[PDB]
Amino acid sequence: SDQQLDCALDLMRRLPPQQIEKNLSDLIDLVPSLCEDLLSSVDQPLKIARDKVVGKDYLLCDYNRDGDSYRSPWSNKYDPPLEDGAMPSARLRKLEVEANNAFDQYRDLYFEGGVSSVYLWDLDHGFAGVILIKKAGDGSKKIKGCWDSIHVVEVQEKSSGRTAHYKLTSTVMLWLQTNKTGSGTMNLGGSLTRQMEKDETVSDSSPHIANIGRLVEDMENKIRSTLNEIYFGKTKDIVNGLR
């Protein structure tokens, strides 16, 4: 059991990253005891749902789940309907709507498409939030790809609200596929997880969302360069050392 957790995590690091969902399904089917422990440690590609009140897409994770229902960031309603589903406070929901709008613009500026969603919840000495971004590359028989990123941020306030400590845990899941005549079929698949702690001043001009925004932006920019130049470039050098 506890040792099987070590083996299941190891097996996920070695199986092809483009089949995370199918592998976790087959892995949990093999050992049902780990159904709870796997999903808590390995991130899955995000699924999309349509808000039925205002007709906008939003992304599903455990943080916006309650039972078998998911809460929409747009209408703040559960789907399937829940009479008494977990809601954020009025104060935090206001923040949540501003964070969704801000990262929506962020998504549009860096991704030019896809879907983004933000969910906040309260902690004893602050609040936490998730930022989810999904961008699929569809519309070509020969060139395919998909980006999924998940950002878990923890906010702790101090100095009577003038400074705050931000803890950020980010995972990017990326795959690319080209089918060309010279290079045949090429599949590149990756996942990268990184963390970042930081103190930032909280003011009228530098509010929590601006701090979280700059934090997520720097992390995704850094993870994109790392995936490209350190990790994908390394596999290229390995290819040129095989022959």
């Binding site: 943080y63 789940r65 309650d66 039972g67």
Partner: peptide
Amino acid sequence: SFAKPKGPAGKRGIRRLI
């Protein structure tokens, strides 16, 4: 390295996918 913040409290249901 360091742990992720605790999830929202008072939530029914166990974890699942899709």
